[model samples]
Target: TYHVDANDHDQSRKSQQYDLNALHKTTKSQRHLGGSQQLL
Candidate 1:
């Protein structure tokens, strides 16, 4: 089942999924550029 807030409808999981994707994109660029950095 698709869980939604239903306050005019919104998917909470999708919201965080986008957040994680965006975060990974940022990390994948700079962190990977730094060759698998373990710290910020």
Candidate 2:
């Protein structure tokens, strides 16, 4: 096919989003500190 449809152009930008309150806050006591720890 030499040409593309308009629907195909929009398909590339399609994404789903949801609340991360449950996923991130699963552990009440543990904190998520992002860093590389040295294991020795």
Candidate 3:
């Protein structure tokens, strides 16, 4: 293509709102704290 479309631009911007923190929190509690000792 000679140039990109406006819709493509919008989608690229929308993709910026990745909830990375939410995912980290979700998986954070999944692991046991190692301060006490190594755990499952």
Candidate 4:
């Protein structure tokens, strides 16, 4: 149910379900760090 674009693909190809836990954790950490920085 996702979309992945390729250079040669004429239409938007349906992409597969990807593992996003790592990315989510990175985003959460960044949010925490940013919040902490605001306290300084």
For candidate 3, write residues 1-40 as lDDT tens digits.
1223347664563223435654422333434544332334
Cα lDDT of candidate 2 equals 0.34
- TM for every model, in the order presented, reads 0.16, 0.14, 0.15, 0.15
- All models: lDDT? 0.41, 0.34, 0.39, 0.38
Model 2 agreement with the true structure over 1-36: per-residue lDDT tens digits: 122334656465322221264442233333445423
The predicted structure with the larger lDDT, 1 or 2, is 1
Candidate 4 local lDDT, 1-40, one digit each (tens): 2234355367643233233543322232334534532334
Q: Alpha-carbon error at 2 in model 4, in Å?
A: 0.2
Please give the distance, in angstroms, between residue 24's alpha carbon in candidate 3 and its true position after superposition. Answer: 35
lDDT by residue (1-40, candidate 1, tens digit) is 2224335344333422345436632434435445554555
Ranking by TM-score: 1, 3, 4, 2
The 10 consecutive residues of candidate 3 with the worst lDDT sum are: 22-31
Clashes of 3: 0
**At residue 25, what lDDT does model 3 achieve?**
26
Query: Relative to the unseen true structure, what is the C-alpha lDDT of residue 8 in candidate 3, on a scale of 0 to 100?
Result: 66
